[PDB]
């Protein structure tokens, strides 16, 4: 799931000690063409009873249920993707009345209602990169929480890490070999990892990339 | 840890 490539990319950037450079030129590592197609804009952990609900930046919503099934509702509020335990996938609509999914659809709508009522949309002011017209939406593969962060792994290979204390977030893509950093002031910047290696970066980003490698190691080992 | 994203 591209995790191995992610780990190697992070190992390489971190080994270069990017914050120990004197004349840091972080802006030279920016590549707005590498902005992600998707990131997680909201989430709610109700895994003690139902599962983990989330919103993607395109306003689609999803749930990773406790039975290890996944349901996605598109931003049109009708189109569905349903992914079974084995990875089997169906493309359906709510309006067609899929009898056997109506319960799970209802649960997803309750997740959707809670998120709309209560939660802020991360990166709301940023236009995501356009994907291929015939590309399916990714699902949440896995997630875990530490004392300091939530780690979210999408089926397109992206790894997202949200830090609780200061609301800073990383979105890592192994296909672009890029990192998006959303800072304490909500500033959204996308960098090529190889260019961070060459040009350097601030202590704040470097520290978070070190933590990211530890998290990616955990994702890799828990497979 | 928290049970939801930023409210």
Author numbering:
A (entry chain A): 372 to 594
B (entry chain B): 73 to 79
Pull text from the paper:
The PBD domain is responsible for the proper cellular localization of Plk1 through an array of phosphorylation-dependent protein–protein interactions mediated by the phosphopeptide-binding groove. Disrupting these interactions has shown potential as a strategy for anticancer therapy. The discovery of an auxiliary flexible pocket on the PBD surface, which is involved in binding a peptide derived from polo-box interacting protein 1 (PBIP1), has been recently reported. Our objective was to prepare more potent ligands of the PBD by improving binding to this auxiliary pocket by optimizing the hydrophobic interactions whilst retaining the key hydrogen bond.
A series of analogues of PBIP1-derived peptide 1 a with phenylalanine replaced by other acetylated hydrophobic and aromatic amino acids (2 a–f) were prepared and tested in the FTS binding mode assay. Interestingly, the pocket turned out to be very specific for hydrophobic aromatic residues. None of tested aliphatic residues (2 a–d) showed ΔΔTm values higher than 1.0 K. To confirm the binding modes, we co-crystallized two representative examples with the PBD, the leucine-based peptide 2 a (ΔΔTm=0.3 K) and the most potent ligand 3 j (ΔΔTm=4.1 K). As predicted, peptide 2 a turned away from the pocket, corroborating the result of the assay.
